[PDB]
Structure formats: C-alpha cells, structure tokens
From a paper:
M1.[name] is a DNA adenine MTase that belongs to the type II R-M system. M1.[name] encoded by ORF hp0050 is an N6-adenine methyltransferase belonging to the β-class MTase. It has been reported recently that this enzyme recognizes the sequence of 5′-GAGG-3′, 5′-GGAG-3′ or 5′-GAAG-3′ and methylates adenines in these sequences. The structural basis and the catalytic mechanism underlying such a distinct activity are not well understood due to the lack of an available 3D structure of this enzyme.Here, we report the crystal structure of M1.[name] from [name] 26695, which is the first determined N6-adenine MTase structure in [name].
The cofactor-free and AdoMet-bound proteins were crystallized at different conditions. Both structures were determined by means of molecular replacement, and refined to 3.0 Å and 3.1 Å, respectively. Four and eight protein monomers resided in the asymmetric units of the two crystal structures. The two structures are very similar to each other and could be well overlaid with an RMSD of 0.76 Å on 191 Cα atoms. Some amino acids, particularly those within two loops (residues 32-61 and 152-172) in both structures, were poorly defined in electron density and had to be omitted from the refined models. The overall architecture of M1.[name] revealed in these structures resembles the AdoMet-dependent MTase fold in which a twisted seven-stranded β-sheet flanked by six α-helices forms the structural core. In agreement, a dimer of M1.[name] was observed in our crystal structures with the two monomers related by a two-fold axis. An area of ~1900 Å2 was buried at the dimeric interface, taking up ca 17% of the total area. Another difference locates at the highly flexible loop between β4 and αD (residues 33-58) of M1.[name], which was invisible in our structures but present in the structures of M.MboIIA and M.RsrI. Collectively, M1.[name] possesses a long disordered TRD, which is in sharp contrast to the secondary structure-rich TRD in other β-class N6 adenine or N4 cytosine MTases or the extra DNA binding domain present in DNA MTases from other subgroups.
Author numbering:
A (entry chain A): 1 to 33, 58 to 159, 171 to 232
B (entry chain C): 1 to 31, 62 to 113, 115 to 156, 172 to 231
C (entry chain B): 1 to 31, 59 to 115, 117 to 153, 155, 173 to 231
D (entry chain D): 1 to 31, 61 to 110, 118 to 146, 148, 150 to 155, 172 to 231
The structure:
C-alpha cells in the first residue's frame, strides 16, 4: 500500500488525528537542521507511532544532541546513531580542512517498545553504506535502513518525503508507505517514481 | 618540555591566569561545558581545540564553543575493530567522536600529508597512534599542547614522540602517576 | 452537564478525536515545552465561534500568544487579577501580586465577550469568584467549556453555578477526587 | 549634568564604545528591537539595571534576551492608563539587573503598580526607585524627553538619544537646553 499527500505537514497532521492513524515507523529527513521550531514536527507526529515503533531522523552533528534529548522528552528512547559515507566529496578545500564525506542519522524507539532491528546475520556495524553518489538520496541507503528497522507489513511514514525514495524503498521492500511533500514539483516526482495516477 | 600537574582543572586554572599562560592547542577527552569557558582564554590567536565527546553532547559543545570565540570547523571520528553487548537488538558502538574548533580569526594549522583528506584517521587492532595523528595534523613541532584532563597521558606521550611540548592536568591519583611513569620522573 | 476524567491530557486527546468532541471554550491553567504543545493538539476541538482563556506567566505569554496566532487563533487581549497575600522579597524587590491570563478567539469567529450593565474592562478583580466572572464573560449559558487541567475543579464549579456544561481532565488522583467531590459523584 | 544627542542609537553606540562610556541604568521605551539590548548592555555598570517599556506580545522575548546578555530579570511593572473586547488600560515595563549586581531598588517608607492615571510622575517615581541621586541614566530612545526631565528634577545626570528632530527639539527645550 502506498499513499502520498501533497500538503503541509503541520496541517494534514490534524486530519491524521481525526482518522486515528497509526504508523509503525517515521523515517525522514526534516528541513533546516529558538530551537522548537523545528524540533516541533517531532512532538506533533510522535503520537502516531505504534507502541513497538521506532523513528529514524537524518540530521547534522550541530543538532543531533538537541533532537535526541527532545525525542526522549516526547516518549522515545534513543538507542543509537547511524551514518553513511560518500566516496567522492565536493571536496571542497583540502589543504586547510577535512572533506565532509559523512552524513548522520538518529535511531530512537518508543519507550517500552519491542523494536525491530533485524540484523541480516552478520554481525553488524554502525555504517550501512560506503555508497557512491557524489556532489540525494540513494535508493540503496534507504532500502537498508528500511530493511533494518521495519518488517514487511509495518507502516512507514515520511512527513517530508522529498523526491520519494523513502516510499520507493518501502515499495521494493513491500512495506506500506505513507508520505507527505509540500512543494508540487517534488511531489509530482515522487508520485511518478511511485507510478500511481 | 613536558610539564604535568596533579590537581583539579577548575582551580589550578586560576593559577594559570596569574602566570599569564598561553597555549597553542587544547586536546582533551573530559570526564562539562564550563571548563571550556575558563580554559579558552589560555589559547593563542591561531590556536585550536580538539575535544573528544559523545553524540549526545557534540551539538552542545559545538554551540558553547562558538559562544566563546571559537569557530567549529569540523568533527572527527575514529573506529574500533574490537568493541560486544547485545548485537541482535542493537548496533555495536564502534565509533567515537571528537570536535575540532579553531580560534575565530585564527590562521589554523591543518597540515595534510602526501595522503588525502577524509574525516576518520584510524581503525584499530585512547590509542597512541590516533593521538599521534591528531597531533601530527592540528599542531606544528614546537607548539604547546594542553590536556586539562590527560588521564593515562597518551596525549602527552604522543607529543613527546612528535617533539611537541606537552602540559597536562589529572585529578585522580592513580592515573596521574601512571602518566608520570609513562613519560618519565 | 458535567463530565470529568482522571487521565493525561496528552493521551485522552486522541479519544476526543475518536468521539469527534467539539467544545465551545477552553479555559485552563496548565502546570517548558509541553506548555505550547497542548495548544496545537486541543485547538481543533473548538467550535468556529469559540475562544480560549489561558493562564500564563509574563515569561511565557509572548510565546503562547504568538503560538496561538499560528494555530488558527487570534489573540484578542490579556486579562489580569491581583492576589492580596503573595509571598517570596520585599526589601530588595517588588511583591508579586499579579497573575495573567491570555484571551484568544478562533480566527473567523464571531466571539462571545458579553459585558454587563456598566462600562470598560481588563481587570476582573481582590478562586471561584474570579472564574465565575471569566466564565460569565467569555461563554454563554449553554456553551461547552473544557479544562484539560482542571486541578481542584473550580473551573467546572463556576460552570456549574453558571449552568455552562463543563468538561475537565485531571492527572493527579488527589486533586481529581477533590474536584469529583466538589461537583458530585 | 544633562547630555543629549540627535542620532541613530544603532551607530552612535559605536562612538560610545570608543569613549569607553559607562552608564548606571538604561530606562527607555523603544519605538530588530531585541539587538539594541545586545549592543547597549556592555555600557551598564556591574550594579546597574535596565528598565524597558514593552508590549505583552514581546515582554517574554525581551526578558529572555536580557538574560542572554548578562542581566537577570527581576520583575515587570505596569501602569494605567469597543463594546466587544476589553479596554486597554495597561502598559508594561521589564526590570532587569546585572548578574552579580548589588542593585538599587530603593523603596519609600513602605511594598507593583506605580500609578492609577508619558506622565512625569510615573517616570519620576520609577527613577526615584531604581536609581540613586548621582547615578547615570541612559535613554537611547528618549523621544519627547521626560526621562531626562525626571532625571533633571531628581538630579540624576541624564544621557539621551533621539533620531527624529521634532521630538529632539521638544526634549531640548524642556531641558533648557
């Protein structure tokens, strides 16, 4: 099942309250990254998650401490952080500074939740991909995140879905996606990648 | 030159003000925001800091630094090949962090090898080799490196092998004399 | 009609969505963070012509008012009342005698108001008497008032004396049974 | 001593840094409006305070901002003075002191609401309270004056700034010059 909306996440959320919607996991990459604003989508969307559900939020090292504390204020337990590295950076300036090859994501679960994890064998580390693509997002990255923290019929929610790619990953993994995007061009891009019409 | 102290970093620091001390780089792994503000005045105009931290803090420490006249340039990380608690419900934590910040108008060091870039100096078999690479990068041979919490040393030992002139402080008696043995009398 | 619950306002709210509850006025004094978040969740329950009256602090009220205006409410005004027996300086400081409340209405609403025989406004009082006048003003006789934090009651009691059909929630069991007895069981 | 300037508070402030100026209390009613605080805070002496007239749609922000700049927010003071809404009787002011300050306060014979009916009496009573006889009072936006005039009558050594010339010459006349 794939269902996407063209809307403002801070408005359709009220409609989700009326429908008493339940989703298994929110896997998203929020905008930006008073800090409330916007940690606030978290406080607003946190009630949708099932007792055993989790969250995965992509972010910047200048924020993650704030996001994590906020999550644990809203009824989640932060288990760990995951990362993925790009092999071809911008660079940009290599004689005065490090290249930023690395992006981060936060992983938190509901408080008394029995969470998924789900671990192919092997036994496994903190960084899903060495990836390729230079300069988002790679389908392969999202597929491995979604392969890990969700199971086949669990409901995945991406309040900012952008191009899709969270939804596309869920589809290939047969995971029942719901997603939201504000701007029409990205919405139409996600909608075409996901067929429908 | 190597000089170590057995003391509380939050008290002997005042003695440093009286001595009008200046240091080139502070490289440490503290055992939390406020020591930065008190040890920041010791830093030279072109100096930097490298502070080991946790992902639950690193965002705070970065912001606190930028309030005190430093610019957070980047973060570095290094991985252990040997951690394991329950691997079936969770990731193993292989990854450790440090924050890299420089003085505001500083002309900082960097100093890359023939090698190139990235964000991650080492994997493993804390480690002297790691500290050796941090100090090799962010300091020059005669600069003064300060470690307000030096623990075992190894910031000091790395500095000694690289001929970089260490100063350090340790509160707990066991670790200090361990550090005192590792360098020399 | 009076209905009270022993529960957490941040959970039972979903039950209010299932029941499609609609309320005319929310008049409450919450016990920072979550002080803004209940607004966004409880706001949809208010009828097109309804209002809110929120007790708050001068250290907050600018936030709450502005938050109200992003959520489909219009901040109309603030009201205040004075306490005759405050306590902490007094030799170094003002006595804190004054408490505030926020008054907001739904955006396109034709709101209640409803002033008595004489003239003018803004400082109701010198408690039941306070709430009776607030409720006498901003609601009409058969309208529905909701107090997600009712504490001792007294928001409900004012509604009962004024025949205004109260709903209220209280988390702490001691205060709830206080309100439950104060009304009846 | 009374000293007034006709200028913009957001640049002449730099001249005040050059003169190494220090003022004991800033008492003002500004016409964004948070940052003048950040620039004018260093001028305040260790035991000094600030009194800022503001709106309840702001008062919480200004307070938080004051406490970001090295002041501690003590309290607010207020004074008086459509059929469908309340009449607006109330104006606010924020009162803050420097952090480790031993501040003024200075209450009468004795005990938040100074007046029942800017009035010179209001400002005179504020200044009678939060300053002492020779302390230096600064009003970066002084408008019509009346902060300077209270300070003159109470012998408090005023400094003030106004951008618009109409109010300035009115303030200049009231202070003689």
């Amino acid at each position: 099942m794939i269902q996407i909306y063209h809307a403002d996440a801070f408005e359709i959320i009220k409609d989700f309250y009326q429908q008493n919607l339940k989703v298994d996991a929110i896997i998203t990459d929020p905008p930006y990254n008073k800090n409330f604003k916007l940690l606030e989508w978290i406080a607003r969307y946190a009630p949708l998650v099932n007792p055993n559900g989790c969250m995965v939020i992509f972010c910047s090292y200048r924020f993650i401490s704030y996001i994590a504390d906020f999550l644990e204020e809203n009824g989640f337990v932060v288990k760990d952080f995951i990362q993925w590295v790009k092999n071809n950076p911008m660079p940009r300036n290599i004689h005065r500074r490090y290249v930023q090859d690395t992006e981060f994501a936060l992983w938190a679960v509901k408080k008394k939740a029995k969470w998924v994890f789900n671990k192919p064998k092997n036994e496994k580390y903190l960084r899903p991909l060495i990836l390729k693509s230079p300069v988002q997002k790679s389908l392969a990255l999202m597929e491995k995140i979604i392969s890990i923290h969700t199971n086949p019929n669990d409901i995945v929610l991406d309040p900012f879905m952008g191009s899709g790619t969270t939804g596309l990953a869920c589809k290939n993994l047969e995971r029942n996606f719901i997603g939201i995007e504000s701007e029409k061009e990205y919405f139409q891009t996600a909608k075409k990648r996901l067929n429908l019409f």
